[PDB]
Amino acid sequence: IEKQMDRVVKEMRRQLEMIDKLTTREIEQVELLKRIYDKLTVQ
Amino acid sequence: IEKQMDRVVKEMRRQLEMIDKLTTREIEQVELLKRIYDKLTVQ
Amino acid sequence: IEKQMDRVVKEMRRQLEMIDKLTTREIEQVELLKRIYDKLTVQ
Amino acid sequence: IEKQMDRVVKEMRRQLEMIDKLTTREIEQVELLKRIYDKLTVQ
Ligand SMILES: [Ca+2]
């Protein structure tokens, strides 16, 4: 159970890394959406 | 195992916070998209 | 440890529900993005 | 606790699959956004 639970902890931290990466990319989308909207308002 | 239980709980609280922030950013994104869509119809 | 691990399982299933909900909303964004792109190609 | 360990592992595998799918949909989304952005510049 000790080793099995140690694997669980490692796998959780791995999935947190995936979520952090996803978060950064989703923020990049907000920057693009804002830029697109501004271009339409300008036109 | 009580120590590793504490590690698991800690990681899960971190995950919850990150998922919660993904959800609030999703809201921001879709409402931008809907504005953009409105303007392409209006134009 | 039994009750503590039972709480962990419940909290995991709860976070899976959040992720499922987020997934559905993210798909809705793809539909909007596709529609926006088509409107530009049309114009 | 061995039974509850199996429940935890099962939920974590499900989560991984769902996060993985969120990441591939993110790719689809941003490349649509970039196309849209290109066209507003080109137009
Ligand atoms: Ca998105």
Side-chain angles (χ1 to χ4, degrees), chain A residues 1 5-6 8-9 11-43, chain B residues 1-2 4-9 11-12 14-42, chain C residues 1 5-6 8-9 11-43, chain D residues 1-2 4-9 11-12 14-42:
Chain A
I1 63 177
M5 194 146 49
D6 190 43
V8 162
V9 172
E11 176 61 23
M12 282 178 147
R13 282 169 182 161
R14 180 169 157 289
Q15 299 191 17
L16 267 54
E17 291 190 53
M18 290 182 77
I19 296 165
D20 172 67
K21 281 176 31 181
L22 179 56
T23 295
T24 299
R25 292 171 192 174
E26 289 275 316
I27 293 174
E28 297 169 336
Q29 289 192 24
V30 172
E31 296 200 38
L32 277 165
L33 283 161
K34 285 183 170 187
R35 293 206 303 163
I36 288 163
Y37 185 62
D38 284 354
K39 284 182 170 188
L40 289 174
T41 302
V42 169
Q43 292 164 359
Chain B
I1 62 166
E2 290 160 51
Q4 292 168 303
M5 274 297 322
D6 291 334
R7 288 173 203 168
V8 170
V9 177
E11 300 304 340
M12 286 172 66
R14 294 169 215 184
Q15 183 187 132
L16 184 55
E17 294 177 317
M18 298 177 78
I19 296 163
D20 187 54
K21 188 51 192 130
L22 283 169
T23 307
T24 65
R25 185 154 9 271
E26 191 287 317
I27 294 166
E28 184 172 16
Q29 290 165 346
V30 73
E31 294 304 321
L32 278 160
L33 285 166
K34 290 159 57 178
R35 289 179 83 188
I36 291 162
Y37 186 67
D38 285 345
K39 290 197 158 55
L40 286 174
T41 299
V42 170
Chain C
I1 63 177
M5 194 146 49
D6 190 43
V8 162
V9 172
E11 176 61 23
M12 282 178 147
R13 282 169 182 161
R14 180 169 157 289
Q15 299 191 17
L16 267 54
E17 291 190 53
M18 290 182 77
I19 296 165
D20 172 67
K21 281 176 31 181
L22 179 56
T23 295
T24 299
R25 292 171 192 174
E26 289 275 316
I27 293 174
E28 297 169 336
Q29 289 192 24
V30 172
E31 296 200 38
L32 277 165
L33 283 161
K34 285 183 170 187
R35 293 206 303 163
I36 288 163
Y37 185 62
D38 284 354
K39 284 182 170 188
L40 289 174
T41 302
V42 169
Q43 292 164 359
Chain D
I1 62 166
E2 290 160 51
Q4 292 168 303
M5 274 297 322
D6 291 334
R7 288 173 203 168
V8 170
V9 177
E11 300 304 340
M12 286 172 66
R14 294 169 215 184
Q15 183 187 132
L16 184 55
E17 294 177 317
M18 298 177 78
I19 296 163
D20 187 54
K21 188 51 192 130
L22 283 169
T23 307
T24 65
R25 185 154 9 271
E26 191 287 317
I27 294 166
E28 184 172 16
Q29 290 165 346
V30 73
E31 294 304 321
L32 278 160
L33 285 166
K34 290 159 57 178
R35 289 179 83 188
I36 291 162
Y37 186 67
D38 285 345
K39 290 197 158 55
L40 286 174
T41 299
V42 170

